[PDB]
Design brief:
Residues 99-289 form the Plant heme peroxidase family profile domain. This is Peroxidase. It comes from Saccharomyces cerevisiae (strain RM11-1a). Belongs to the peroxidase family. Cytochrome c peroxidase subfamily. This protein has 289 residues and is mainly alpha-helical. The protein has 2 domains: 1-141 and 261-289, Peroxidase, domain 1, CATH 1.10.520.10; 142-260, Peroxidase, domain 2 (Orthogonal Bundle), CATH 1.10.420.10. Helix content is 46%, strand content 6%. The chain is built from 14 helices and 5 strands. The chain has helices at residues 13-29, 33-36, 40-51, 71-74, 83-95, 101-115, 148-156, 162-169, 179-182, 196-203, 228-235, 237-247, 250-266, 284-287, and strands spanning 3-4, 206-210, 216-220, 225-226, 269-270. The longest helix is centred in the N-terminal third of the chain and has 17 residues, at 13-29. The termini are far apart. Bound molecules: protoporphyrin IX containing FE. Protoporphyrin IX containing FE binds next to helix 3, helix 8 and helix 9.
Amino acid sequence: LVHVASVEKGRSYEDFQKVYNAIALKLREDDEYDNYIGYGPVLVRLAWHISGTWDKHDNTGGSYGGTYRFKKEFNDPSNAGLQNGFKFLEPIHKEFPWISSGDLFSLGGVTAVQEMQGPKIPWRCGRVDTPEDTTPDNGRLPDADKDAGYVRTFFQRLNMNDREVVALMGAHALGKTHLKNSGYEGGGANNVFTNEFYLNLLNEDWKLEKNDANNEQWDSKSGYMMLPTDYSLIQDPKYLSIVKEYANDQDKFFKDFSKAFEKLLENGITFPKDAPSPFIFKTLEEQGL
Ligand code: HEM
């Protein structure tokens, strides 16, 4: 099963920068959302969830087809809350109706990371919408109640190794959990992309507590939280080494996250040899906008 990237007709860097800019300007405008977190984090989560359905064994799922627009996927219980991201992107899609859905969802994540002062994430266009019957079944995204061996095995389906897993998890510096969406009680939340997830893991005094949904999570008296799967990164000695590395080197974490997140957003896509090179979008700030 082969998905070949096909550039939206006649489009180039400039076109996709305009789309980036529209998303970025909306991120700035719509600042109230989720107790002033803004939409950055949920856009990153959306990009991950539309990509994280991928299965390396048969090339099903993945970002290419834009299948999140279909009810089966949109109503996946693992996607609860992501409707807010989709709503946010709707006016952008209406303004730029030529962009494919998988391009838009993935670009929303790139834009979010960058505007939140994260690393540059090179991004390639050419995802093509596919029909409703190509929508992956629910149950391909990970559970949060498990341990390190679960996390490791899970991410092998996505072709991610230990370093890639630990780097990608660092996105949990962004935003929070919501009891109503996932059964986890939200803790202190940020909308700036840093290596703080790793610092929190290593430096806080964590207590295993039960929340009001009767699920266990790790909390600190300072008001942070970790999912079981987050905490697993300091329980497993291989993950722990990488946690420490990223807690001690912001730049390395940025570089590794950029590579892993691009890879995640690109899994399943075949880029023709004469496809454009990846785009690196300027932030609003870099443009003086
Ligand atoms: C074992 C892997 C993972 C698990 C079990 C997991 C689980 C969760 C859960 C339970 C939430 C809370 C949802 C809600 O209540 O609204 C969430 C939020 C979030 N996740 Fe993950 N996640 C994982 C990996 C990732 C990855 C790889 C990324 C992206 C690189 C990511 C990005 C985010 C972001 C940015 C949010 C915050 C959303 C917001 O503030 O609305 N997660 N995750």
